[PDB]
Design an enzyme around this catalytic site. Structure first.
Site, PDB file in Angstrom:
ATOM      1  N   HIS A  83      12.242 -10.213  30.145  1.00 25.30           N
ATOM      2  CA  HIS A  83      13.164  -9.001  29.637  1.00 25.30           C
ATOM      3  C   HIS A  83      13.521  -9.500  28.055  1.00 25.30           C
ATOM      4  CE1 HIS A  83      16.628 -11.178  31.284  1.00 25.30           C
ATOM      5  NE2 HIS A  83      17.459 -10.563  30.736  1.00 25.30           N
ATOM      6  N   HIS A  85      16.361  -9.950  26.544  1.00 27.06           N
ATOM      7  CA  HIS A  85      17.562 -10.916  26.083  1.00 27.06           C
ATOM      8  C   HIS A  85      17.089 -12.244  25.412  1.00 27.06           C
ATOM      9  CE1 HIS A  85      20.520  -8.532  28.712  1.00 27.06           C
ATOM     10  NE2 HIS A  85      20.438  -7.975  27.722  1.00 27.06           N
ATOM     11  N   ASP A  87      17.772 -15.280  25.889  1.00 23.59           N
ATOM     12  CA  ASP A  87      17.460 -16.511  26.980  1.00 23.59           C
ATOM     13  C   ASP A  87      16.138 -16.261  27.494  1.00 23.59           C
ATOM     14  OD1 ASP A  87      18.303 -14.012  28.466  1.00 23.59           O
ATOM     15  OD2 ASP A  87      18.646 -15.583  30.298  1.00 23.59           O
ATOM     16  N   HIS A 148      18.890  -5.659  36.268  1.00 19.25           N
ATOM     17  CA  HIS A 148      19.662  -6.492  35.194  1.00 19.25           C
ATOM     18  C   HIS A 148      19.357  -5.776  33.871  1.00 19.25           C
ATOM     19  CE1 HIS A 148      21.241 -10.037  32.664  1.00 19.25           C
ATOM     20  NE2 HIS A 148      20.034  -9.655  32.130  1.00 19.25           N
ATOM     21  N   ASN A 179      26.240 -10.576  32.949  1.00 22.91           N
ATOM     22  CA  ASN A 179      26.440  -9.677  31.874  1.00 22.91           C
ATOM     23  C   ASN A 179      25.741  -8.242  32.478  1.00 22.91           C
ATOM     24  OD1 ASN A 179      26.032  -8.045  29.591  1.00 22.91           O
ATOM     25  ND2 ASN A 179      24.150  -9.328  28.782  1.00 22.91           N
TER      26      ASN A 179
END
Ligand SMILES: [Zn+2]
Ligand SMILES: [Zn+2]
Ligand SMILES: [Zn+2]
Length: 232
Positions: A83, A85, A87, A148, A179
Protein backbone atom coordinates in the site's frame (compact mmCIF):
# COMPACT_ATOMS: atom_id res chain seq x y z
CA UNK A 1 12.01 -16.45 18.46
CA UNK A 2 10.35 -13.64 16.44
CA UNK A 3 12.23 -10.28 16.61
CA UNK A 4 10.65 -7.32 18.63
CA UNK A 5 11.59 -3.53 19.20
CA UNK A 6 13.96 -4.53 22.11
CA UNK A 7 16.06 -6.73 19.72
CA UNK A 8 16.32 -4.31 16.79
CA UNK A 9 18.92 -1.46 16.94
CA UNK A 10 17.89 1.93 15.40
CA UNK A 11 18.26 1.86 11.62
CA UNK A 12 18.83 -1.92 11.69
CA UNK A 13 16.86 -4.89 10.33
CA UNK A 14 16.41 -8.52 11.35
CA UNK A 15 15.33 -11.47 9.18
CA UNK A 16 13.19 -14.40 10.33
CA UNK A 17 13.29 -17.58 8.21
CA UNK A 18 9.85 -19.16 7.94
CA UNK A 19 10.43 -21.89 5.41
CA UNK A 20 12.70 -22.98 2.62
CA UNK A 21 13.10 -19.80 0.61
CA UNK A 22 10.70 -17.62 2.72
CA UNK A 23 11.60 -14.94 5.35
CA UNK A 24 10.07 -11.95 6.97
CA UNK A 25 12.07 -8.76 7.48
CA UNK A 26 11.57 -6.74 10.66
CA UNK A 27 12.50 -3.11 11.25
CA UNK A 28 11.50 -0.42 13.69
CA UNK A 29 10.52 3.19 13.39
CA UNK A 30 9.47 6.12 15.55
CA UNK A 31 6.14 7.80 14.89
CA UNK A 32 4.63 10.48 17.21
CA UNK A 33 7.29 9.54 19.79
CA UNK A 34 6.30 5.81 20.03
CA UNK A 35 8.36 2.99 18.46
CA UNK A 36 6.71 0.50 16.16
CA UNK A 37 7.98 -2.74 14.62
CA UNK A 38 7.16 -3.34 10.96
CA UNK A 39 7.28 -6.44 8.77
CA UNK A 40 7.89 -7.25 5.15
CA UNK A 41 8.53 -10.47 3.25
CA UNK A 42 11.32 -12.04 1.18
CA UNK A 43 10.63 -14.96 -1.16
CA UNK A 44 13.26 -16.91 -3.10
CA UNK A 45 12.67 -17.77 -6.73
CA UNK A 46 15.52 -19.79 -8.17
CA UNK A 47 18.64 -17.70 -7.69
CA UNK A 48 16.92 -14.35 -7.13
CA UNK A 49 14.72 -12.81 -4.46
CA UNK A 50 11.32 -11.16 -4.51
CA UNK A 51 10.93 -8.46 -1.81
CA UNK A 52 7.54 -7.47 -0.37
CA UNK A 53 7.61 -3.95 1.12
CA UNK A 54 10.41 -1.65 2.18
CA UNK A 55 11.73 -1.50 5.75
CA UNK A 56 10.07 1.90 6.48
CA UNK A 57 12.53 4.50 5.27
CA UNK A 58 15.76 4.89 3.35
CA UNK A 59 18.15 4.08 6.25
CA UNK A 60 16.28 0.94 7.24
CA UNK A 61 15.92 -0.15 3.63
CA UNK A 62 19.69 0.17 3.01
CA UNK A 63 20.17 -1.94 6.18
CA UNK A 64 17.64 -4.44 4.81
CA UNK A 65 19.62 -4.90 1.60
CA UNK A 66 22.84 -5.37 3.59
CA UNK A 67 21.16 -7.92 5.88
CA UNK A 68 19.83 -9.86 2.87
CA UNK A 69 23.33 -9.93 1.37
CA UNK A 70 24.77 -11.14 4.74
CA UNK A 71 22.16 -13.80 5.57
CA UNK A 72 20.99 -14.98 2.12
CA UNK A 73 23.46 -13.72 -0.49
CA UNK A 74 21.10 -13.65 -3.44
CA UNK A 75 20.06 -10.50 -5.33
CA UNK A 76 16.71 -8.81 -4.90
CA UNK A 77 15.45 -8.37 -8.47
CA UNK A 78 11.84 -7.22 -7.94
CA UNK A 79 9.94 -5.62 -5.08
CA UNK A 80 6.22 -5.11 -4.49
CA UNK A 81 4.75 -2.47 -2.16
CA UNK A 82 1.42 -3.48 -0.68
CA UNK A 83 0.00 0.00 0.00
CA UNK A 84 1.05 3.63 -0.33
CA UNK A 85 2.14 4.44 3.25
CA UNK A 86 5.78 5.17 4.06
CA UNK A 87 6.28 1.86 5.89
CA UNK A 88 5.69 0.13 2.52
CA UNK A 89 7.23 2.55 -0.01
CA UNK A 90 9.74 4.57 2.06
CA UNK A 91 13.02 3.24 0.73
CA UNK A 92 11.85 2.61 -2.84
CA UNK A 93 14.52 5.02 -4.12
CA UNK A 94 17.22 2.96 -2.30
CA UNK A 95 15.85 -0.18 -3.96
CA UNK A 96 15.75 1.47 -7.39
CA UNK A 97 19.35 2.73 -7.06
CA UNK A 98 20.41 -0.84 -6.22
CA UNK A 99 18.89 -2.12 -9.51
CA UNK A 100 15.67 -3.53 -8.03
CA UNK A 101 12.54 -3.25 -10.23
CA UNK A 102 9.90 -1.74 -7.89
CA UNK A 103 6.22 -2.46 -8.42
CA UNK A 104 2.86 -1.39 -7.05
CA UNK A 105 -0.70 -1.20 -8.28
CA UNK A 106 -1.70 1.94 -10.23
CA UNK A 107 -3.85 2.94 -7.20
CA UNK A 108 -0.92 2.66 -4.81
CA UNK A 109 1.30 4.67 -7.21
CA UNK A 110 -1.31 7.43 -7.52
CA UNK A 111 -1.94 7.61 -3.76
CA UNK A 112 1.80 7.66 -3.00
CA UNK A 113 2.21 10.58 -5.42
CA UNK A 114 -0.65 12.54 -3.82
CA UNK A 115 0.85 11.95 -0.37
CA UNK A 116 4.40 12.85 -1.37
CA UNK A 117 5.72 9.34 -0.69
CA UNK A 118 8.17 7.42 -2.93
CA UNK A 119 6.55 5.89 -6.00
CA UNK A 120 7.37 2.36 -7.26
CA UNK A 121 8.31 2.44 -10.94
CA UNK A 122 6.35 -0.47 -12.41
CA UNK A 123 2.60 -1.01 -12.36
CA UNK A 124 0.82 -4.22 -11.32
CA UNK A 125 -2.12 -4.79 -13.63
CA UNK A 126 -5.18 -6.93 -12.98
CA UNK A 127 -5.77 -5.98 -9.33
CA UNK A 128 -8.27 -3.10 -9.45
CA UNK A 129 -11.42 -5.09 -8.53
CA UNK A 130 -12.02 -6.65 -5.11
CA UNK A 131 -11.32 -10.40 -5.32
CA UNK A 132 -8.72 -10.01 -8.12
CA UNK A 133 -5.63 -12.24 -7.95
CA UNK A 134 -2.53 -12.33 -10.13
CA UNK A 135 0.60 -14.45 -10.08
CA UNK A 136 3.89 -12.70 -9.44
CA UNK A 137 6.61 -15.33 -9.63
CA UNK A 138 6.63 -17.42 -6.41
CA UNK A 139 3.66 -15.56 -4.92
CA UNK A 140 0.08 -14.69 -5.66
CA UNK A 141 -1.00 -11.06 -5.19
CA UNK A 142 -4.60 -10.48 -4.09
CA UNK A 143 -6.69 -7.32 -3.80
CA UNK A 144 -9.29 -8.09 -1.10
CA UNK A 145 -11.04 -4.74 -1.22
CA UNK A 146 -10.58 -1.60 0.84
CA UNK A 147 -9.52 -2.14 4.46
CA UNK A 148 -6.59 -0.38 6.18
CA UNK A 149 -6.30 1.57 2.93
CA UNK A 150 -8.22 1.50 -0.35
CA UNK A 151 -5.23 0.06 -2.22
CA UNK A 152 -4.03 -2.59 0.24
CA UNK A 153 -2.80 -5.88 -1.27
CA UNK A 154 -2.17 -9.22 0.38
CA UNK A 155 0.47 -11.74 -0.71
CA UNK A 156 0.29 -15.55 -0.56
CA UNK A 157 3.26 -17.92 -0.91
CA UNK A 158 1.69 -21.20 -2.04
CA UNK A 159 4.80 -23.38 -1.52
CA UNK A 160 4.97 -22.42 2.17
CA UNK A 161 1.28 -21.66 3.01
CA UNK A 162 2.35 -18.18 4.12
CA UNK A 163 -0.23 -15.40 3.97
CA UNK A 164 1.25 -11.91 4.25
CA UNK A 165 -1.65 -9.70 5.23
CA UNK A 166 0.18 -6.43 5.41
CA UNK A 167 -1.37 -3.60 7.36
CA UNK A 168 -4.93 -4.84 6.70
CA UNK A 169 -4.21 -7.53 9.35
CA UNK A 170 -3.42 -6.73 12.98
CA UNK A 171 -1.30 -8.74 15.37
CA UNK A 172 -3.07 -10.15 18.47
CA UNK A 173 -1.27 -7.68 20.78
CA UNK A 174 -3.06 -4.81 19.05
CA UNK A 175 -6.51 -4.66 20.69
CA UNK A 176 -7.56 -1.18 19.52
CA UNK A 177 -7.46 0.34 16.08
CA UNK A 178 -4.28 1.81 14.66
CA UNK A 179 -4.06 4.46 11.93
CA UNK A 180 -7.50 4.49 10.27
CA UNK A 181 -7.16 7.86 8.52
CA UNK A 182 -7.02 6.19 5.13
CA UNK A 183 -9.18 3.16 6.02
CA UNK A 184 -12.55 1.97 4.83
CA UNK A 185 -13.95 0.83 8.16
CA UNK A 186 -17.29 -0.03 6.60
CA UNK A 187 -15.68 -2.46 4.12
CA UNK A 188 -12.76 -3.77 6.16
CA UNK A 189 -14.55 -6.87 7.60
CA UNK A 190 -15.92 -7.76 4.13
CA UNK A 191 -12.42 -7.45 2.68
CA UNK A 192 -11.06 -9.72 5.41
CA UNK A 193 -13.78 -12.28 4.60
CA UNK A 194 -12.57 -12.26 0.96
CA UNK A 195 -9.06 -13.11 2.24
CA UNK A 196 -10.42 -15.99 4.35
CA UNK A 197 -12.44 -17.33 1.39
CA UNK A 198 -9.50 -17.13 -1.02
CA UNK A 199 -6.73 -18.51 1.27
CA UNK A 200 -8.48 -20.82 3.77
CA UNK A 201 -5.49 -23.18 3.61
CA UNK A 202 -3.04 -20.54 4.99
CA UNK A 203 -0.89 -21.74 7.91
CA UNK A 204 1.32 -18.79 8.78
CA UNK A 205 -0.23 -15.27 8.74
CA UNK A 206 1.98 -12.21 8.90
CA UNK A 207 0.51 -8.86 9.99
CA UNK A 208 2.06 -5.60 8.76
CA UNK A 209 3.27 -4.88 12.30
CA UNK A 210 4.09 -7.39 15.01
CA UNK A 211 3.94 -11.09 15.64
CA UNK A 212 2.82 -13.74 13.14
CA UNK A 213 -0.07 -16.08 13.85
CA UNK A 214 -2.61 -18.20 12.00
CA UNK A 215 -5.89 -17.40 10.25
CA UNK A 216 -7.20 -16.36 13.72
CA UNK A 217 -5.50 -13.02 13.01
CA UNK A 218 -8.27 -12.36 10.46
CA UNK A 219 -11.02 -12.86 13.08
CA UNK A 220 -8.98 -10.82 15.56
CA UNK A 221 -8.68 -7.93 13.12
CA UNK A 222 -12.39 -8.00 12.37
CA UNK A 223 -13.14 -7.94 16.10
CA UNK A 224 -10.90 -4.89 16.62
CA UNK A 225 -12.21 -3.04 13.56
CA UNK A 226 -15.84 -3.65 14.55
CA UNK A 227 -15.17 -2.47 18.11
CA UNK A 228 -13.63 0.74 16.71
CA UNK A 229 -16.55 1.16 14.31
CA UNK A 230 -18.85 0.96 17.39
CA UNK A 231 -16.90 3.65 19.39
CA UNK A 232 -19.34 5.86 21.36
ZN1 LIG B 1 -0.51 1.82 6.33
ZN1 LIG C 1 12.19 -1.87 -14.69
ZN1 LIG D 1 1.80 -0.37 8.27
Amino acid sequence: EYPTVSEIPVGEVRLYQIADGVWSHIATQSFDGAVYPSNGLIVRDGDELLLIDTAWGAKNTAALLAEIEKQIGLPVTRAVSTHFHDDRVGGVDVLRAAGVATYASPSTRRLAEVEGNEIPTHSLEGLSSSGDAVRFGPVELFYPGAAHSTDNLVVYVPSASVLYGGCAIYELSRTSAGNVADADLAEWPTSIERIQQHYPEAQFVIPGHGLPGGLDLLKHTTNVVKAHTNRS
